[PDB]
Design a protein around this nucleic acid. Structure first.
Ligand SMILES: [Zn+2]
Lengths: 148, 99, 718, 167, 49, 490, 99
RNA sequence: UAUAUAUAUAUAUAUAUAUAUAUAUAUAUAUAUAUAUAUAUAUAUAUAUAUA
RNA sequence: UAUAUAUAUAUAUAUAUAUAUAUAUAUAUAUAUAUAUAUAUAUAUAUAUAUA
């Protein structure tokens, strides 16, 4: 527990205890390899691991994701209402909260623990079309998000 | 309860070595709690006041450690006892070897 | 007071007079034994678990419950809404034990939006913005708790105030649900042992009971079973049920200090001397069964010595079957009949059991019962009862009183249970052979039998292809072998679809619209393809049928057509998990097996349905007397006339659509299907029944066919 | 009523052959009854197939490596959450071999009186076998006591029997 | 409503929204009596249907 | 209609399944063929559904529960019986004058009850209805009860994902129906060759012995990736016995989704139990079961469209190349995929060939191609009912060489369906009938001048009406003609 | 090497006293520079020829606003998240498997 | 504030009821020992019958 | 001489019944202690009403 939850034992005679609860690293290494042998090496193997870890992460965490301050800080920007394009709307049309409470973020974090087995990649659809120009605002915003 | 706890302490004095009064485990604050958590602070106040009444010889150390626990973050002292830490629950100390 | 935590098994009887019996009925045999146990397991807690089951993970639920002391001394005291609640402290001023200001109270009475102020600063107030564990933590303190919601867990929940404040704030059924908790408490007593459904910290004085059976899937806490079991396993805390009978507890079998040879251990000695004149003169829904370990042996050697033999475990054989047959432990009975087949009673034990496994391990085996195996078994001995408990039977495998169809592979021993068993009694009405439907009936109906026609079509093929197919079916490793088998399957499918389906569809009333029908089929497809409204149960027996039918030589086919048909039906059958057929047999015959154990005579009943004479005469029937005719649809049995009459006033909401031809072939149909669970569990039904006139002498001439509708009414008879 | 005495002999349905042992009758049914080439498909080759299948049957083996082949099993997270059964303790005699009574001693009552003395005559259980010929055989956990045990054992009959099945 | 509002968060959301709305619509004096679509009226629509 | 069962030409052998998991059986890896393709597809979709925080969002949960309630409904009597049978005392609100058989009414009764208590009621009878047609047999309406509709949720969800994430539901998003108009117009242009296909009776051919068992197993396996203890829609996780290993059987927990599948498979294997109560006939109500899928509304289009797409894809990419003979056909059959060559909705489907270079495929190859497809459908009991006439039939729209042809006969001027012995309507409703009648004559392009004249005459007759009290007075009224102008008649 | 884990970002031991948003973490630096670059892009000649300056003025504004949000995530990544991983690595049924 | 009345709470006394514990008496059940009777099984003796 | 059957006597084993002794459990009666509830009396506190 990273020295959290420090605890100790009493000091008295314990005559006949026996707690066969341990093994060497080689045993653990062997079991880990064996575990990797008894799976289909496609995504079917990785998904339960990432899912379980992600659930545990979200279960215990002080961090809370809340975009209200960001939007509040964005919508307060003044601009003319006589123009034909408002980039604020373009931005807010993106960053659409899918209601999943941003599973991707926790998914990315969990993937690190098993990077030697599975890798997270950016979705192909979330790319600017190669036919566009830099002046096409939605394309530019997409590229910005990819960079971030 | 007619403050039976108070009288029990006095009676136990005449029979120490056969039975010892100890501060109840639940009375201590959580060792992970901070000093800022006011109810914890008042608990330490009560423990410190009531300490000498008990017959447990380890009450002085236990009383001391309670405050040390709440001051773990603002007052990071080093405890020269292997296997123990400033965050260890105070009620656990007992045996003289870990003073 | 040692505590034993108990998790109910698959069909744990709950409405039993004592929860204790469903654990292991041997504990009730002796007064000296039953006095050593407490039970707890209160109903209010049961209801709370039923609700919260859908809202907590197993780990959370275990973590929450594990700390609760045995007798729950605390209560949850629901508070009414502030406008309602505030008036209470003035209706009785001394009830303002927190001494909330009068000004604030009447300010709340004046406000359009009465605030939580009346709740505010009240010690141990639980707002709706709280969690389950918050309650449980306070439960350990034993003091009552004040809450603002009904969905709470850990303590009985009762109103804090009289019902007048909660009325309007809550509704009738809600206002009703708290009544037992309003006067909840009952004492708990300090005997040697106390069973409990409530989990607890496993330790030196707490044990987990191991019954070696699957949990109750419906019971909300069954999900805890793995975690509990493994923790007990790693510390050697499991208790086999037999250990409970000993004077001092120890986890183990065959202990040194005890021979375990006493009447208490012998579960076969089921005895019922006591009585209370209770309405359950018998509860024919509760059935005692046993798990037994039996040793099998072959012929001795040339010098009288014998091989070590093998011992197997038979699961959940009904005990009355053995008792009525005078079976006793430690007796080496002969296993084989004159013709080498099993003695009938053993076959019955196998048929009504749930499963057969090697005694030590957990590997299930299908037993052979023919001349296949070398050094075959000739002697059998029952050694001990691993478990002996009562189990609930009501409506478990089958649901409707109308009829039910059981599917079994070809070569099963259905003939034994349907003929020998009732013949072994032949004194009490069990069934009518005219009502049971042999699976072969329709195949025998065609003028050239379905088997003959299949054979006649089949021979047109080249013999080598047929030979290749048969060998492939027998040889397990012969995967597919498409050519040979598929050709045969096409002929089978083409023929069956062509002839069997219309013939089957032409017997619809015969299968369902009789009094009560028990039917057999080789596959569920035989019914679904014909649209026959009858429940189908996919059964299985723990004996190898393939070898069994290989011994039946006197057939149309030379034992080769049989295996072909067997494979075809199995291929035709739909893929699904099949159930043990013994459970269905237990539901049907089980209650009857308990009849000889009864002390008082039975009382007959029926639910005759009326028939106006107008339609009968209008149909050309010659009938004497004006009163409407009536026909017995189904007879039942009870023994307490008092409660039986007390239960006869219910008006079943199921009409009957009676139909009868001029040939007096009579049929019945219930427009709302009649479910078995609707039958009060004190009743007792025959396995099959045939509808008939209550007084055939009333009619003087059968006119044309007749149909009519009428209500149903249970009535006595003499 | 349930029978309580084994049949003196066993009977086949059509051959009228009576057998002192059901095993002998079983072989007769297994072999002699099953040639019968009289129908449209009762070929000799299928008779061989049936005969082979009969001889090859065994449905009560603990181990079955033949059929366990190709039992591709997927790794499951909950499945490994059981832990092995390590704690198994025995209070019986730590032994795995048994002394036997392979050939019993004769009971003489007219001539040769006194040459034999059974401890039963003094109501005592002998500590050693007292047969005419006594053997040592391997019967694991024959004196076990206290709890069920691992669930797989080795038991050999006295060499007067085949004992082939163990191998 | 009970079938609709299985949980409590939705009920809290709708109640807060309705309370704020009527408060704003009257105080800001946009208008009063504006039948704004809200979940509290969905059961009413069902009942009428 | 329901007396039909599909005929499978190569059934899945019983040895192709694993040990049971309480009710379902997983498919052995060694098995190949179209069934394997179907199994993998559904399993993959189930995996994607498994981890998806889109659900457990309280708002989304509200959408699903609310989706189940409509003014219509059925099977309420079966519901009341089954629950009363299990000792559940439902509330009643008769004084509130609302039909008991309405899906709303039964939903209100359920609100308080803990869901798991209701599980026994899903195996209950379902009423039925019939809607007549103009050029075919009458359609069927089979409304499930609210509980059954709730249990079948995973089946719908997976089907939706398959549709929306493979071939974009082939227009089953139905956003505006007019998106099929340019599609068939393009499909009928000279440079393109198009083939019209549709399952003979998809509702009657989907069944448990072949299809649903595979789907149930795939879904149950596909949900294995996920927290074994995670209740879904109030359905908690439970313990089930695993018997895949004959040497090491045991029991393990399964998530609520899997529990739903366990019951859902049980229901499908048992087959639907309908109860007919036709009023036109006399005193002849009865009940009989069938494997026919309900398919009473658009909620069924998702499942059939998913399976439709799956089988077609396997046929194009695997079965046909391995089996066809013409080398030229192989050359053109390859480099073809459903996402840009095939669309469907329920049974209906359209298949269009890649543009043969300035040419057309030999009718000989077409016959070879069409023949093989028929056999492919025959394998698992689908009569494909295909045709090739260089025209476009899709959702009852007809196009010839890029010109739309309104099939006016499907909108008879005088005909109107009535599914009950009584019209059961009041006079003013006739006006709306007139308005709807006139619009069809505009949608279909008729002689606009003469159609208008006829329309006004119809309006004039409809403009007037009356009513009489059951015992007392009469009443009468009629509209000024300007009303119909406001209603949309020039 | 055993009992060690790799981490894509730089990491620090758990802080002692209360946390607060910071601006020197690696992630925060990555964010600021990225925003700064794109702002430079928007003002490049390529945009000026086609994009009305008013909109351009707006776009650089909103990007500026994003750069100034006092988010907590960058601190959490550098200081607190590694602890959570280190603990949970001993809990999951499958130990971490890294490269 | 004082007096009087009513209600509620707390303390003390008395009465009544219920529960639990301990002691004494009586009854019943179960177990163990001893005695007596009856039944069944086995052995031995005697008589009678039948067979060899 | 041997076997079988029947009767009688004696010995041993098992079951059942009755009597006596010892142990355990349950029920009932009486005494004592403790707890809880209800009623009555007295004291104190709080609230309400009336009078000054
Ligand atoms: Zn023979």
């Amino acid at each position: 527990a990273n020295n959290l939850l420090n605890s100790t034992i009493p000091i008295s005679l314990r005559p006949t205890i026996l707690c066969p609860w341990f093994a060497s690293s080689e045993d653990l290494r062997l079991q880990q390899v064996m575990h990797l042998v008894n799976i289909s090496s496609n995504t079917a193997a990785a998904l339960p691991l990432v899912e379980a870890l992600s659930t545990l992460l979200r279960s215990v965490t002080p961090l809370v994701l809340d975009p209200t301050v960001l939007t509040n800080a964005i919508t307060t920007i003044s601009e003319s209402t006589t123009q034909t394009i408002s980039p604020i709307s373009e931005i807010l049309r993106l960053l659409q909260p899918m209601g999943n409470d941003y599973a991707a973020f926790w998914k990315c974090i969990a993937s690190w623990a098993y990077n030697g087995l599975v890798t997270t990649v950016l979705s192909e659809d979330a790319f600017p079309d190669s036919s566009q120009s830099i002046t096409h605002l939605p394309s530019m915003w997409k590229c910005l998000f990819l960079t971030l | 309860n007619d403050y039976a706890a108070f009288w029990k302490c006095i009676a136990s004095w005449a029979y120490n070595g056969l039975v010892t009064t100890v501060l109840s485990e639940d009375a201590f604050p959580d060792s992970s709690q901070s000093i800022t958590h006011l109810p914890s602070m008042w608990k330490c106040l009560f423990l410190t006041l009531a300490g000498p009444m008990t017959s447990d010889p380890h009450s002085p150390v236990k009383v001391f450690m309670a405050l040390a626990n709440l001051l773990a973050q603002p007052e990071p002292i080093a405890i020269g006892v292997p296997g123990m830490h400033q965050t260890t629950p105070a009620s656990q100390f007992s045996h003289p070897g870990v003073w | 007071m040692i505590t034993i935590v108990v998790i109910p098994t698959a069909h744990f009887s709950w409405t039993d007079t004592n929860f204790l019996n469903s654990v292991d009925y041997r504990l009730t045999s002796q007064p000296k034994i039953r006095d050593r146990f407490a039970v707890y397991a209160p109903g209010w807690l049961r209801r709370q678990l039923d609700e919260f089951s859908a809202s907590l993970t197993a780990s959370e639920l275990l973590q929450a419950l594990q700390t609760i002391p045995i007798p729950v001394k605390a209560r949850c005291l629901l508070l009414p809404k502030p406008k309602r609640f505030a008036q209470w402290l003035l209706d009785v001023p001394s009830a303002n034990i927190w001494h909330i200001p009068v000004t604030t109270l009447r300010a709340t009475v004046a406000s359009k939006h009465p605030s939580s102020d009346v709740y505010n600063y009240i010690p141990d107030h639980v707002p709706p913005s709280a969690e389950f564990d918050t309650v449980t933590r306070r439960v350990a303190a034993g003091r009552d708790i004040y809450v603002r919601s009904t969905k709470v867990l850990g303590a009985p929940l009762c109103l804090a105030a009289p019902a007048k404040y909660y009325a309007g704030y809550l509704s009738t059924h809600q206002l009703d649900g708290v009544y037992p908790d309003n006067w909840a408490p009952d004492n708990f007593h300090k005997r040697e042992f106390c069973l409990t459904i409530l989990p607890s910290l496993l330790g030196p004085r707490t044990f987990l009971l191991d019954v070696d059976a699957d949990r109750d899937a419906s019971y909300p806490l069954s999900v805890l079973w793995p975690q509990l079991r493994v923790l007990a396993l790693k510390s050697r805390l499991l208790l086999p049920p037999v250990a409970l009978l000993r004077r001092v507890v120890d986890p183990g079998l065959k202990p040194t200090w005890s021979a375990d040879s006493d009447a208490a251990f012998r579960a076969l000695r089921l005895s019922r001397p006591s009585s209370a004149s209770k309405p359950t003169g018998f509860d024919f829904s509760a059935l005692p069964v046993v798990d037994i370990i039996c040793l099998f042996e072959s012929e001795p050697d040339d010098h009288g010595r014998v091989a070590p033999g093998t011992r197997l475990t038979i699961h959940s054989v009904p005990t009355d079957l053995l008792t009525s047959l005078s079976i006793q432990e430690g007796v080496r009975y002969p296993l084989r009949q004159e013709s080498g087949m099993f003695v009938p009673w053993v076959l019955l034990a196998l048929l009504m059991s749930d499963d057969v496994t090697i005694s030590g391990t957990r590997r299930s085996v299908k037993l052979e019962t023919a001349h296949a195996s070398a050094r075959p078994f000739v002697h059998i001995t029952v050694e001990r009862c691993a478990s002996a408990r009562v189990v609930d039977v009501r409506g478990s495998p089958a649901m409707y009183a109308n009829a039910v169809c059981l599917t079994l592979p070809k070569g099963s021993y259905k003939s034994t249970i349907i003929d020998t068993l009732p013949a072994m009694f032949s004194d009490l009405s069990i069934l009518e052979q005219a009502a049971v439907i042999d699976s072969d009936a329709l195949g025998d109906s065609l003028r050239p039998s379905f088997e003959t026609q299949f054979l006649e079509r089949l021979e047109n093929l080249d013999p080598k292809l047929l030979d290749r197919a048969v060998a492939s079916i027998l040889s397990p490793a012969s995967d597919t072998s498409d050519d040979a088998v598929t050709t045969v399957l096409d002929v089978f499918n083409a023929l069956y679809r062509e002839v069997m389906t219309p013939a089957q569809r032409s017997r619809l009333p015969l299968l369902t619209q009789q009094g009560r029908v028990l039917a057999f089929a080789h596959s569920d497809y035989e019914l679904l393809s014909a649209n026959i409204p009858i429940q189908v149960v996919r059964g299985s027996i723990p004996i190898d049928h393939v070898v069994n039918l290989l011994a039946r030589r006197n057939r149309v086919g030379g034992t080769a057509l049989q295996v072909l048909l067997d494979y075809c039906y199995r291929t035709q059958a739909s893929p699904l998990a099949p159930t043990p057929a013994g459970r269905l047999y237990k539901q049907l015959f089980g209650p009857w097996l308990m009849v000889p154990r009864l002390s008082d005579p039975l009382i007959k009943l029926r639910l005759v349905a009326s028939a106006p004479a107008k339609v009968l005469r209008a149909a050309g029937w010659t009938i004497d007397g004006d009163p409407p005719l009536e026909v017995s649809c189904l007879c039942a049995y009870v023994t307490d006339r008092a409660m039986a009459a007390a239960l006869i006033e219910r008006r079943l909401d199921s009409r009957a659509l009676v139909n009868v031809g001029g040939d007096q072939l009579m049929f019945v149909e219930y427009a709302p299907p009649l479910p078995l669970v609707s039958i009060p569990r004190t009743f007792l039904l025959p396995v099959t029944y045939v509808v008939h006139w209550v007084s055939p002498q009333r009619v003087l001439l059968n006119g044309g066919n007749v149909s009519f509708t009428s209500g149903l009414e249970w009535t006595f008879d003499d | 009523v349930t029978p309580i005495v084994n049949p003196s002999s066993y009977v086949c349905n059509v051959c009228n052959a009576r057998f002192s042992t059901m095993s002998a009758l079983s072989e007769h049914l297994r072999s002699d009854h099953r040639d019968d080439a009289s129908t449209l498909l009762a070929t000799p080759m299928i008779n061989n197939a049936i005969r082979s299948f009969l001889t090859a049957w065994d449905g009560i083996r603990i181990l079955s490596p033949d059929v366990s082949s190709k039992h591709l099993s997927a790794y499951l997270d909950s499945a490994v959450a059981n832990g092995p059964e390590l704690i198994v303790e025995d209070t019986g005699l730590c032994t795995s071999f048994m002394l036997l009574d392979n050939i019993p001693s004769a009971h003489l009552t007219k001539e040769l009186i006194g040459f034999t003395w059974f401890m039963q005559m003094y109501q005592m259980t002998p500590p050693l076998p007292e047969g005419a010929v006594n053997r040592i055989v391997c019967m694991t956990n024959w004196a076990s006591l206290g709890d069920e045990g691992r669930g797989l054992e080795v038991r050999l009959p006295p060499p007067t029997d085949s004992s082939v099945h163990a191998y | 409503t009970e079938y609709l509002f299985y949980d409590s968060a939705l009920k809290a959301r709708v109640m807060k929204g309705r309370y704020n709305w009527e408060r704003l619509s009257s105080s800001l004096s946009l208008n009063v009596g504006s039948r704004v679509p809200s979940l509290f009226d969905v059961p009413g629509k069902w009942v009428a249907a | 209609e329901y007396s039909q069962v599909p005929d499978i030409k190569d059934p899945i052998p019983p040895s192709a399944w694993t040990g049971p998991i309480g009710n379902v059986r997983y498919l052995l890896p060694s098995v190949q063929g179209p069934a394997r393709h179907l199994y993998d597809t559904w399993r993959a979709a189930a995996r994607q559904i498994a981890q998806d925080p889109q659900w457990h969002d309280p708002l989304n949960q509200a959408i699903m529960r609310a989706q189940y309630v409509t003014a219509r409904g059925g099977s309420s009597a079966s519901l009341k019986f089954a629950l009363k049978v299990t000792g559940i005392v439902l509330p009643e609100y008769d004084d509130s004058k609302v039909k008991k058989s309405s899906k709303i009414y039964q939903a209100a009764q359920i609100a308080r009850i803990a869901f798991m208590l209701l599980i026994a009621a899903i195996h209950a009878e379902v009423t039925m209805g019939i809607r007549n047609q103009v050029q075919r047999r009458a359609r069927s309406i089979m409304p499930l009860n609210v509980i059954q509709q709730a249990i079948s949720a995973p089946h719908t969800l997976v089907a939706n994902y398959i549709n929306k994430h493979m071939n974009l539901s082939t227009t089953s998003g139905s956003v505006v129906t007019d998106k099929v108009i340019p599609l068939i117009l393009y499909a009928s242009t000279p440079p393109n060759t198009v083939v019209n296909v549709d399952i003979k009776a998809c509702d009657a051919s989907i069944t448990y012995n072949y299809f649903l068992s595979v789907i149930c197993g795939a879904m149950h396996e596909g949900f294995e990736v996920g927290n074994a203890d995670a209740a879904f829609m109030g359905v908690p996780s439970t313990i089930v016995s695993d018997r895949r290993s004959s040497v090491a059987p045991y029991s393990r927990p399964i998530s609520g989704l899997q529990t739903m599948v366990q019951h859902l498979a049980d229901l499908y294997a048992a087959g639907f139990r309908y109860s007919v109560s036709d009023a036109f006939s006399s005193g002849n109500k009865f009940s009989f079961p069938t494997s026919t899928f309900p398919s009473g509304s658009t909620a069924t289009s998702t499942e059939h469209t998913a399976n439709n797409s799956t089988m077609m894809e396997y046929f194009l990419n695997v079965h046909a190349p391995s089996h066809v003979k013409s080398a030229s056909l192989k050359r053109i059959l390859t480099d073809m995929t459903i996402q840009r060559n095939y669309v469907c909705q329920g049974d209906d489907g359209i298949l269009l060939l890649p543009h043969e270079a300035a040419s057309k495929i030999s009718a000989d190859d077409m016959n070879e191609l069409l023949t093989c497809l028929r056999d492919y459908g025959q394998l698992f009991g689908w009569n494909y009912d295909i045709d090739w006439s260089d025209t476009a039939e899709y959702l009852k729209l007809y196009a010839l060489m890029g010109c739309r042809i309104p099939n006016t006969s499907r909108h008879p001027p005088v005909g109107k369906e009535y599914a009950a012995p009584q019209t059961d309507e009041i006079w003013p409703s006739l006006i709306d009938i007139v308005i709807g009648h006139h619009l069809n004559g505009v949608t279909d392009v008729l002689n606009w001048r003469e159609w208008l004249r006829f329309s006004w005459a119809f309006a004039c007759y409809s403009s007037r009406g009356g009513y009489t009290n059951p015992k007392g007075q009469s009443f009468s009224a009629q509209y000024p003609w300007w009303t119909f102008v406001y209603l949309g008649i020039p | 090497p055993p009992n060690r884990m790799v981490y894509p970002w730089p990491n620090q031991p758990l802080p002692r006293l209360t946390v607060a948003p910071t601006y020197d973490s690696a992630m925060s630096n990555w964010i600021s520079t990225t925003i700064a670059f794109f702002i430079r892009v928007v003002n490049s000649v390529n945009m000026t020829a086609t994009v009305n300056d008013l909109t351009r003025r707006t776009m650089t504004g909103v990007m500026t606003a994003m750069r100034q949000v006092k988010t907590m995530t960058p601190f959490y990544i550098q200081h607190m998240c590694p602890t959570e991983l280190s603990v949970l690595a001993s809990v999951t049924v499958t130990p971490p498997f890294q490269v």
